[PDB]
mmCIF file of C-alpha atoms and ligand atoms in Angstrom:
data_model
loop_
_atom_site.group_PDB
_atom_site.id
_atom_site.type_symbol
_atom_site.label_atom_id
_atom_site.label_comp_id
_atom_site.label_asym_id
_atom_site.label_seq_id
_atom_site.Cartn_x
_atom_site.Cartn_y
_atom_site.Cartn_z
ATOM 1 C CA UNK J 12 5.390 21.037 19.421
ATOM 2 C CA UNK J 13 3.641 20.819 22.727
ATOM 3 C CA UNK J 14 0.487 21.496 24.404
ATOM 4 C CA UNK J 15 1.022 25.763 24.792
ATOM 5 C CA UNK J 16 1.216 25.487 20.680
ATOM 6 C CA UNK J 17 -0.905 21.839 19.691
ATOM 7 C CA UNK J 18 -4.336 20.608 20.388
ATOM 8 C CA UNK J 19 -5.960 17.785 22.460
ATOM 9 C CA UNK J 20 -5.521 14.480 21.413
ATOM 10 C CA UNK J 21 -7.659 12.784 19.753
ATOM 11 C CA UNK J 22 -9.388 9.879 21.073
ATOM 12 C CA UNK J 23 -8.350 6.418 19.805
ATOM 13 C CA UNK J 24 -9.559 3.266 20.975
ATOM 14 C CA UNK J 25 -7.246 0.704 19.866
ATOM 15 C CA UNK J 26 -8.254 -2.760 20.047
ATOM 16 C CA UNK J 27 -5.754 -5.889 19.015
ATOM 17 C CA UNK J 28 -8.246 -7.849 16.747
ATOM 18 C CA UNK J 29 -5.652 -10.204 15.331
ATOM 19 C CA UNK J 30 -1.834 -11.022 15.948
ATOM 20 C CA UNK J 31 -0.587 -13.467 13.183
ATOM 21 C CA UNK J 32 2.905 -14.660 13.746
ATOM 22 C CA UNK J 33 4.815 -15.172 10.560
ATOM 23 C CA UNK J 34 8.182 -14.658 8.184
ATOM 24 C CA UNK J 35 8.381 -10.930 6.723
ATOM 25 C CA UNK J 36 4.785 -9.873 5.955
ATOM 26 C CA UNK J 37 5.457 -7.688 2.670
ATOM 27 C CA UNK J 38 2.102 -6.688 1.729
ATOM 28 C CA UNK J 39 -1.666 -6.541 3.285
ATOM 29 C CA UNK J 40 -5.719 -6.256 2.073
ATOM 30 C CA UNK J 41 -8.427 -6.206 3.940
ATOM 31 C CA UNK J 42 -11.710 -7.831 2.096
ATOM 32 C CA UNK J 43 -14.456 -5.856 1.769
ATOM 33 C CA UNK J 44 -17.180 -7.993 2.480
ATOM 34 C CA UNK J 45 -15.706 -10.863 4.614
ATOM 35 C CA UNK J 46 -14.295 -10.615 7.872
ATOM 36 C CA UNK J 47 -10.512 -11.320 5.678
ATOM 37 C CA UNK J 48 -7.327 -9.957 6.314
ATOM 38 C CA UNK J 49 -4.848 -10.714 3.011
ATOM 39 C CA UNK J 50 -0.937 -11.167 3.712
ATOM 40 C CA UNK J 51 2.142 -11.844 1.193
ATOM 41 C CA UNK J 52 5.400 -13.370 2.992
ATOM 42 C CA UNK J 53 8.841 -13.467 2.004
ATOM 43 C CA UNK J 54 8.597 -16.963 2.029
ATOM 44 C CA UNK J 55 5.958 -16.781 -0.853
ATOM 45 C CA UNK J 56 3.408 -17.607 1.053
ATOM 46 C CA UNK J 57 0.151 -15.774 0.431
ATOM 47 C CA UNK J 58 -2.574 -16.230 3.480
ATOM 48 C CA UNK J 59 -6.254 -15.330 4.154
ATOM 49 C CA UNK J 60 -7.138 -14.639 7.878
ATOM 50 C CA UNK J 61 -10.754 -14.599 9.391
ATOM 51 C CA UNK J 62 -10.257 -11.878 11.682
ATOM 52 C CA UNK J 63 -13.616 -12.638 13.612
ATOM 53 C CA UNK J 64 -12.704 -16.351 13.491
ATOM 54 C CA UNK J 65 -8.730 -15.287 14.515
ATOM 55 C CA UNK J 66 -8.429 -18.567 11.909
ATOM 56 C CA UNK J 67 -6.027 -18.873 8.865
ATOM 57 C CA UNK J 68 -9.217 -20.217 6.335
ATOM 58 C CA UNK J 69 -6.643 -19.803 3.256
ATOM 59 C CA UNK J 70 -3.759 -19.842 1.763
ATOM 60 C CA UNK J 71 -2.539 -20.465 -2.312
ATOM 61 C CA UNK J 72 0.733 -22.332 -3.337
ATOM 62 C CA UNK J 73 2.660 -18.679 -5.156
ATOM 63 C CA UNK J 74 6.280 -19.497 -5.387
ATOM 64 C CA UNK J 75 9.033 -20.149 -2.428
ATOM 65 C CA UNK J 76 10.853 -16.380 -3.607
ATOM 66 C CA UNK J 77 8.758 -13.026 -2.046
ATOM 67 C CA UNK J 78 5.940 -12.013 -3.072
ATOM 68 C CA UNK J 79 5.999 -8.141 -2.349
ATOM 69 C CA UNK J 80 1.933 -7.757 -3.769
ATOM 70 C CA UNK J 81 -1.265 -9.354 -3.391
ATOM 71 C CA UNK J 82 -4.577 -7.705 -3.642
ATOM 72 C CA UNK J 83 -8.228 -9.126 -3.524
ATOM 73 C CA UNK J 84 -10.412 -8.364 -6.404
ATOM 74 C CA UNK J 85 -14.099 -9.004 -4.827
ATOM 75 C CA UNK J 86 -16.412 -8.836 -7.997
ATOM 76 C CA UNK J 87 -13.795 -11.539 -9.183
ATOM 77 C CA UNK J 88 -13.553 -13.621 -6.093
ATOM 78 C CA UNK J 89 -9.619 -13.418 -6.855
ATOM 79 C CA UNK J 90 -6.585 -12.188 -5.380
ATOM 80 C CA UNK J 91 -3.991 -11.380 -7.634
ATOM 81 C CA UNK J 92 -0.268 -11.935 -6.809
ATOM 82 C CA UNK J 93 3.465 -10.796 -7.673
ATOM 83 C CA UNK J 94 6.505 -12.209 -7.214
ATOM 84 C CA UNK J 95 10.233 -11.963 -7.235
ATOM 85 C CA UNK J 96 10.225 -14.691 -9.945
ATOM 86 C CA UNK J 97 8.352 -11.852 -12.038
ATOM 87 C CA UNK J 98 4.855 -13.540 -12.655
ATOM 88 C CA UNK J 99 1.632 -12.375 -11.734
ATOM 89 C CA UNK J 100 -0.328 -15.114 -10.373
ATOM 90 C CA UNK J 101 -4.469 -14.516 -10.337
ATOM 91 C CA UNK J 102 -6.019 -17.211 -7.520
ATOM 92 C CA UNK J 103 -9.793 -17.701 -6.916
ATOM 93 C CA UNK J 104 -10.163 -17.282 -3.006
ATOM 94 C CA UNK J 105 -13.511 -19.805 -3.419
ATOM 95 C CA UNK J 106 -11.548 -22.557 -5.091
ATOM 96 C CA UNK J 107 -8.239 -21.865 -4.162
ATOM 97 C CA UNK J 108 -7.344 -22.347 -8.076
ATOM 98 C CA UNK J 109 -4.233 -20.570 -9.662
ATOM 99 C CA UNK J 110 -6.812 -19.649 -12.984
ATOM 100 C CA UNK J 111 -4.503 -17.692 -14.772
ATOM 101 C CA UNK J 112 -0.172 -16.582 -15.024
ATOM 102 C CA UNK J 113 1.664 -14.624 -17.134
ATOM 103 C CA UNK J 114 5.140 -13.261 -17.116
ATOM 104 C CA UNK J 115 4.385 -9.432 -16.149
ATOM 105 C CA UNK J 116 7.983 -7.557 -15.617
ATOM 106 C CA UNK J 117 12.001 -8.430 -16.326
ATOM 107 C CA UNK J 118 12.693 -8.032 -12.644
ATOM 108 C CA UNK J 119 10.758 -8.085 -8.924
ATOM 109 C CA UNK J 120 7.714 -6.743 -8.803
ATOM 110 C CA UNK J 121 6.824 -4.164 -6.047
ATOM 111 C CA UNK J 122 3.383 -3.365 -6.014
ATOM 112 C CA UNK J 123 -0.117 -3.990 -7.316
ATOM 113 C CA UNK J 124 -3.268 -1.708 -7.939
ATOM 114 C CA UNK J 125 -6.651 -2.876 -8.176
ATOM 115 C CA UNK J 126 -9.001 -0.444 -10.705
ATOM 116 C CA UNK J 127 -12.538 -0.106 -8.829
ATOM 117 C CA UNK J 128 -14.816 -0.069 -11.961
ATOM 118 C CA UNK J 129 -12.565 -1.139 -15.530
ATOM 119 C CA UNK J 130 -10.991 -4.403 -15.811
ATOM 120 C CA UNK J 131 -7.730 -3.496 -15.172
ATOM 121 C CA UNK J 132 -4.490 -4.210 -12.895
ATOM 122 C CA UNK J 133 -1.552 -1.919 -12.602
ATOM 123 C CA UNK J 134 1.616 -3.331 -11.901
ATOM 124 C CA UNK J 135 5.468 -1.562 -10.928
ATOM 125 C CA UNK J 136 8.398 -3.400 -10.826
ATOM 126 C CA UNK J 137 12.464 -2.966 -10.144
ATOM 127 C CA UNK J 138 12.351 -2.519 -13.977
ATOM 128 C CA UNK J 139 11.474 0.880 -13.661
ATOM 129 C CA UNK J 140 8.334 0.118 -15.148
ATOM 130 C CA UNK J 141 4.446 0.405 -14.429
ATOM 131 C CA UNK J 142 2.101 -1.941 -16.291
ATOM 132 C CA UNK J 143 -2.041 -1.991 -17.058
ATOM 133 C CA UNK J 144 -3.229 -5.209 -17.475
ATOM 134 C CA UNK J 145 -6.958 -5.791 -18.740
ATOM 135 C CA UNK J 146 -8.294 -8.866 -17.363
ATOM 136 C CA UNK J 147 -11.356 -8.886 -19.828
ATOM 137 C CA UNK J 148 -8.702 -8.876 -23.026
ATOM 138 C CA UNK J 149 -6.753 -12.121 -21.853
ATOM 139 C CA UNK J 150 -4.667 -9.972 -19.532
ATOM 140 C CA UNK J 151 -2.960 -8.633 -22.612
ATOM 141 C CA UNK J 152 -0.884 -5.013 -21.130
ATOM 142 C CA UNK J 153 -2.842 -2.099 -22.654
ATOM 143 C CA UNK J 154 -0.458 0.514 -21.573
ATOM 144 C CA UNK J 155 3.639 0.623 -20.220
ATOM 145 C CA UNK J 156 4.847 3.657 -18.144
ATOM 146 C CA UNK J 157 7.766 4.610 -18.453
ATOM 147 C CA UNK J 158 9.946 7.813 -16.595
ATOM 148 C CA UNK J 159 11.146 5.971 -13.137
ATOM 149 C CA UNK J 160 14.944 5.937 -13.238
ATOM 150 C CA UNK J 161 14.652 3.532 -10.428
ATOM 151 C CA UNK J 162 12.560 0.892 -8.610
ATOM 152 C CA UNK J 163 8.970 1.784 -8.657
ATOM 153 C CA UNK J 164 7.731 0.992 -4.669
ATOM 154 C CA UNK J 165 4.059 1.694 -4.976
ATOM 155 C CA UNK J 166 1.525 2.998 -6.928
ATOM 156 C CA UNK J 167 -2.109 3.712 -6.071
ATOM 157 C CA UNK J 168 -5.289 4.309 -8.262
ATOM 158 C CA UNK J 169 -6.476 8.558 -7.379
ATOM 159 C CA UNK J 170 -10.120 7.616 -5.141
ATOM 160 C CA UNK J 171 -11.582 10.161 -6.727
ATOM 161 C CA UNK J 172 -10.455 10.193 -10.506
ATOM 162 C CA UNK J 173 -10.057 6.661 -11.304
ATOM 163 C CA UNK J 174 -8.162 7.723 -14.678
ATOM 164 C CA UNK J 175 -5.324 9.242 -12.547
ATOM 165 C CA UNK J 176 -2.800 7.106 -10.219
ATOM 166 C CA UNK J 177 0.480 7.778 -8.591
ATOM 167 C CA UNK J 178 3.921 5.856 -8.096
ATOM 168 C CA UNK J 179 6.357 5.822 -5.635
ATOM 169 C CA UNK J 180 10.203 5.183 -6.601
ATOM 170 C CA UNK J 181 13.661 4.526 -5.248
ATOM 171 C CA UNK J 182 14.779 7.384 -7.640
ATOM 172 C CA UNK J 183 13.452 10.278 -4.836
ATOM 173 C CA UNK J 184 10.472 11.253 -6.876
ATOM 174 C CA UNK J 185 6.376 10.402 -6.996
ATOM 175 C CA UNK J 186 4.924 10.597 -10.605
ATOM 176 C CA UNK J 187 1.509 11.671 -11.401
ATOM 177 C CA UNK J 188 -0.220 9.467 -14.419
ATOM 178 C CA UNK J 189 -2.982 8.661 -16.356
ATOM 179 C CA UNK J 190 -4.308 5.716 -18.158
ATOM 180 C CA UNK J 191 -4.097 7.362 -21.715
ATOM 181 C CA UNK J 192 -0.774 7.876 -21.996
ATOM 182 C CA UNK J 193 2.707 6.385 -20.979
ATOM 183 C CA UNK J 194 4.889 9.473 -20.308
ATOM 184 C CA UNK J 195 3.914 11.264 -16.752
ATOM 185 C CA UNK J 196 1.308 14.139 -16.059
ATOM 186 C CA UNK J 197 4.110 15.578 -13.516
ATOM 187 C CA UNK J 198 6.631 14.881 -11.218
ATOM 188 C CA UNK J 199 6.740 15.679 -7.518
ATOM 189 C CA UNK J 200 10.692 16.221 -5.867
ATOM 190 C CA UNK J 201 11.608 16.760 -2.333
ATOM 191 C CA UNK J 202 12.190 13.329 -1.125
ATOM 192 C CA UNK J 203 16.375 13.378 0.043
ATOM 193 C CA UNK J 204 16.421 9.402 -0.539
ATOM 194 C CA UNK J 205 14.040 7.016 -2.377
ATOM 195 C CA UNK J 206 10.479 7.050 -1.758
ATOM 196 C CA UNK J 207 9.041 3.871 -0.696
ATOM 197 C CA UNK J 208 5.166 4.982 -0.202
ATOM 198 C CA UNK J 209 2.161 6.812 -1.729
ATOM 199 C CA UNK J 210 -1.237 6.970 -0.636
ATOM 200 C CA UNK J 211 -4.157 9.325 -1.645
ATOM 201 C CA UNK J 212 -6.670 11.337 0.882
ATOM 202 C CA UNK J 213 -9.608 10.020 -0.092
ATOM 203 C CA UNK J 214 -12.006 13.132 1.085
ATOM 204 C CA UNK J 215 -12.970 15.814 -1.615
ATOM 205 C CA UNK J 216 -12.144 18.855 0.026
ATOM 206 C CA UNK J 217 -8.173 18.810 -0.692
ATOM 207 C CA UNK J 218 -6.245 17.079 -3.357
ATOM 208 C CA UNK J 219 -3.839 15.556 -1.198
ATOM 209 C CA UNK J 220 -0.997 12.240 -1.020
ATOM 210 C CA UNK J 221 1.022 10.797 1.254
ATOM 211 C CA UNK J 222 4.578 9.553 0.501
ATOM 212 C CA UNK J 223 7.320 7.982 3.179
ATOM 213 C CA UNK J 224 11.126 8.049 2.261
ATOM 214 C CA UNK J 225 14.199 6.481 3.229
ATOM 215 C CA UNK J 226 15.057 10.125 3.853
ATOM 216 C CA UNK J 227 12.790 9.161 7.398
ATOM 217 C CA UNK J 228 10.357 11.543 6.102
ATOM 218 C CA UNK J 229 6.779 11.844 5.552
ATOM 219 C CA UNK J 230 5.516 14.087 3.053
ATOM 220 C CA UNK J 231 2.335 15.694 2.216
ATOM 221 C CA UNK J 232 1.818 16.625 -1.557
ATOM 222 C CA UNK J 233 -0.877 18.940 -3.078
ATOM 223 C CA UNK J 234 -1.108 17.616 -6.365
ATOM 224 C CA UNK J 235 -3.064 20.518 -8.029
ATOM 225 C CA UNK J 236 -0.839 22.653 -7.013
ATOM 226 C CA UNK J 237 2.397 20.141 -7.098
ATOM 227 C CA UNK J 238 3.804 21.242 -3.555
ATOM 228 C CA UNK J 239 4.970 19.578 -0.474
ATOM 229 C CA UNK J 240 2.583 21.115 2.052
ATOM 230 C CA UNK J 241 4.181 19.666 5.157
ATOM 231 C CA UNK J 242 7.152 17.197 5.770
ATOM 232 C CA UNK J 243 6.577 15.133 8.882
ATOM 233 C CA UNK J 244 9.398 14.287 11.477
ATOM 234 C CA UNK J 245 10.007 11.361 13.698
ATOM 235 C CA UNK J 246 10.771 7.961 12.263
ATOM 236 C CA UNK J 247 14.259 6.906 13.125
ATOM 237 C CA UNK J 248 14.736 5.051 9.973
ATOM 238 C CA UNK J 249 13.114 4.806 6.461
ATOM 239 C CA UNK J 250 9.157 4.986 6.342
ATOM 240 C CA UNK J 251 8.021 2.696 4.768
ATOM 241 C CA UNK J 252 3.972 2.554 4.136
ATOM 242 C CA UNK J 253 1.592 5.674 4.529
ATOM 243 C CA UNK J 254 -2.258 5.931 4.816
ATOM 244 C CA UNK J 255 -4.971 8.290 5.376
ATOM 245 C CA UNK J 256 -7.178 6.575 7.313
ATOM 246 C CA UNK J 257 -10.723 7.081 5.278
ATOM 247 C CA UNK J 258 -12.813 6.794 8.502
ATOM 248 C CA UNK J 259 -10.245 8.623 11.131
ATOM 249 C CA UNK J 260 -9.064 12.355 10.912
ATOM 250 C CA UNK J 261 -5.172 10.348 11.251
ATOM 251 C CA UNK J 262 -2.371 9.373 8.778
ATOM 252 C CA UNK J 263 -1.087 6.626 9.621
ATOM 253 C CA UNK J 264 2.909 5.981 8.804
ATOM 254 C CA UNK J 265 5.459 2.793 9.675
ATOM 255 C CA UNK J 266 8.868 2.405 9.545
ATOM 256 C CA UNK J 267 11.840 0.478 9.593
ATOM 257 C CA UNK J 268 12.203 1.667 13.437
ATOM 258 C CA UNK J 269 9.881 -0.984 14.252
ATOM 259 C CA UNK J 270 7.067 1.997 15.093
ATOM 260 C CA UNK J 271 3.850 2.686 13.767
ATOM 261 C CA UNK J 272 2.908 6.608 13.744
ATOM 262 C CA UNK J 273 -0.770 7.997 14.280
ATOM 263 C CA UNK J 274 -0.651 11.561 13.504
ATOM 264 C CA UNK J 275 -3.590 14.127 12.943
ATOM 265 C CA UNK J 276 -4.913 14.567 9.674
ATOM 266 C CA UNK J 277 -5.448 18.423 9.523
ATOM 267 C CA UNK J 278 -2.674 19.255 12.465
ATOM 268 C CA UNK J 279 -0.324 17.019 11.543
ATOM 269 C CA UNK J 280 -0.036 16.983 15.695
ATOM 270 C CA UNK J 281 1.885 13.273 16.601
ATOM 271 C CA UNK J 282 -1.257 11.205 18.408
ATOM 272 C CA UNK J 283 0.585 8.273 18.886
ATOM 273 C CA UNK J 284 3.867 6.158 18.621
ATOM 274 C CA UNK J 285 3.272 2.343 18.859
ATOM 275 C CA UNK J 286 6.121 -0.582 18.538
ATOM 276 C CA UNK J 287 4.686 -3.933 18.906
ATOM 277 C CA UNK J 288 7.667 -5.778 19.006
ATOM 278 C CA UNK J 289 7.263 -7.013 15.881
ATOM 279 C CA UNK J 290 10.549 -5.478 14.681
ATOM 280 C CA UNK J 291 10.422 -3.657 11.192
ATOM 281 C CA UNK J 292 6.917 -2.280 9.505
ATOM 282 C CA UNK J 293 6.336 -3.056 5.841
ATOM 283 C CA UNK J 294 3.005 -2.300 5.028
ATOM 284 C CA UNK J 295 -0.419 -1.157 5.750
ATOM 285 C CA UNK J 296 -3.938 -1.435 5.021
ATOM 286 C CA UNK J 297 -7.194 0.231 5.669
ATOM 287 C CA UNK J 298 -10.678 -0.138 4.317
ATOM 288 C CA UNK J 299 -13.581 2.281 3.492
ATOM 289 C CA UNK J 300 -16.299 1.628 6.120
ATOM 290 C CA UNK J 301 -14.258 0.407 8.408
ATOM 291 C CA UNK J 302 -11.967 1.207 11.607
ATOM 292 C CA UNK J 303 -9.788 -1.993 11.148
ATOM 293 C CA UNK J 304 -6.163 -1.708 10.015
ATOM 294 C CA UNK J 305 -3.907 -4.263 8.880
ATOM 295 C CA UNK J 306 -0.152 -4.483 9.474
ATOM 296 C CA UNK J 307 2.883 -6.448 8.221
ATOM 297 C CA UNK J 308 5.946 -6.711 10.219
ATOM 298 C CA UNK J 309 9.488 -8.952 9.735
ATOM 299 C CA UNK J 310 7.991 -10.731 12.834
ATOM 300 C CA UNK J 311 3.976 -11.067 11.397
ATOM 301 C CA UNK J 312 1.214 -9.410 10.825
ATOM 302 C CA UNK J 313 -2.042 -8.274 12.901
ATOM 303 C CA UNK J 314 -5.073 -6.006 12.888
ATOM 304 C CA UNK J 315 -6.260 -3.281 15.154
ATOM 305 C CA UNK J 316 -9.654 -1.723 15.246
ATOM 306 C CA UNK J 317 -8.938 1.673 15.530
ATOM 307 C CA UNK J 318 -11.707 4.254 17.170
HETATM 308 C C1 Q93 O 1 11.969 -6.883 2.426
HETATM 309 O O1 Q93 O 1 12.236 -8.051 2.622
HETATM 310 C C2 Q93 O 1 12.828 -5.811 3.026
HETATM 311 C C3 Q93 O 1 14.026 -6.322 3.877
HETATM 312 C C4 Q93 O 1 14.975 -7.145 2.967
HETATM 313 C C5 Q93 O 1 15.687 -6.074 2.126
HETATM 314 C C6 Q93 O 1 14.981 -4.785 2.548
HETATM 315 C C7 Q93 O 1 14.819 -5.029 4.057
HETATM 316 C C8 Q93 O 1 13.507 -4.849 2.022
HETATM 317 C C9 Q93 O 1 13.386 -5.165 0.541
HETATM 318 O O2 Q93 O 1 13.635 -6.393 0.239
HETATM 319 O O3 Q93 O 1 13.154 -4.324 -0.273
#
């Protein structure tokens, strides 16, 4: 685990692009046309940052519990909210409107996925429960999943097969789904404590995710196969959000030890170990197209253009 036995580091350029001091950031989204950093508070505050502005140019009126989710839609000029109180909440961004609310789960909701081309939302929830939501049928739930014997933490929609998505829960596994049918494709173990995170590598040449524990591990998951193909080492406390970068050859992991962890993508070799002194990491976000990353902290939230 040195340099007789690992490569050269990669070269990162890492520029702070915005630092916006706040209560507990629990989620992030980048826009993907304007210059917009997305962040949900514990405070239930949801805001809208111009990160070539460094100006707060938003923010909607959610509830005064968390809201642990919030997601733009661009071809709807919304973002779309959830809350502790159990509602999703649908905003237009141009307007600043609440246009639509319904009653979604029968406790907090965790996490919120965005499908690229159909009409739909997914939602998970400390019900144990993931939800899809069609927004062109009155946001009436086409679908329940059910086989979480926990709190499902995340869930993200497969890049590559938009039928397929994958959940995170606080009962030590990742499920595998799809949008036909309500009982899992598979299950993926190995996680020692509940997962938190799961994130999919968006390039076509392996069929990889990304899941972070409170075990303090990261995982790597071949989900043709259904192996752990590495287990990553370092945090000091539980991990909670994972990305592969799209842009970057890095994964990039943060934790409850206040750190953010750059590692290499094929390697796995440890680039980089970062606290800002924002104390604990909730969440990140990344964007196709671009080397910007948002992060949410207890202390706030801020960008970095990375490379
Ligand atoms: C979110 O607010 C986090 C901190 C409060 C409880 C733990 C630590 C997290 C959660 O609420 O799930």
């Amino acid at each position: 685990e040195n340099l007789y036995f690992q490569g050269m580091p990669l070269r990162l350029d890492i520029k702070r692009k915005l630092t916006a001091r706040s209560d507990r950031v629990k989620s992030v989204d980048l826009h993907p046309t304007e210059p917009w950093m997305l962040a949900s508070l514990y405070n239930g505050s949801v805001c809208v940052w111009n990160h070539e502005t460094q100006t707060l140019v938003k923010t909607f009126e959610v509830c005064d519990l968390p809201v642990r989710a919030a997601k733009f839609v661009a071809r709807k000029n919304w973002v779309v909210t959830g809350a502790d109180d159990m509602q999703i909440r649908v905003f237009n961004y141009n307007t600043l409107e609440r246009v639509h609310m319904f009653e979604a789960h029968s406790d907090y909701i965790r996490c919120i996925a965005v499908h690229p081309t159909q009409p739909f939302i997914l939602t998970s929830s400390d019900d144990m429960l993931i939800k899809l939501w069609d927004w062109d049928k009155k946001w009436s739930c086409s679908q329940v999943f059910e086989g979480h014997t926990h709190y499902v933490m995340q869930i993200v929609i497969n890049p590559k097969d938009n039928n397929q998505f994958a959940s995170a829960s606080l009962d030590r596994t990742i499920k595998v789904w799809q949008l036909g049918s309500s009982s899992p494709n598979f299950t993926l173990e190995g996680h020692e404590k509940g997962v938190n995170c799961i994130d999919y590598y968006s390039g076509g040449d392996k069929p990889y995710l990304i899941s972070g524990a409170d075990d303090r591990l990261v995982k790597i998951w071949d989900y043709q196969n259904k192996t752990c193909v590495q287990t990553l080492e370092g945090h000091a406390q539980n991990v909670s959000c994972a990305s592969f970068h799209p842009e970057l050859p890095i994964i990039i992991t943060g934790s409850e030890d206040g750190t953010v962890r750059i590692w290499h993508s094929s390697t796995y070799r440890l680039e980089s170990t970062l606290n800002y002194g924002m104390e604990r990491v909730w969440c990140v976000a990344s964007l196709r197209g671009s080397n910007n990353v948002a992060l949410g902290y207890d202390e706030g939230s801020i960008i970095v253009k990375l490379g």
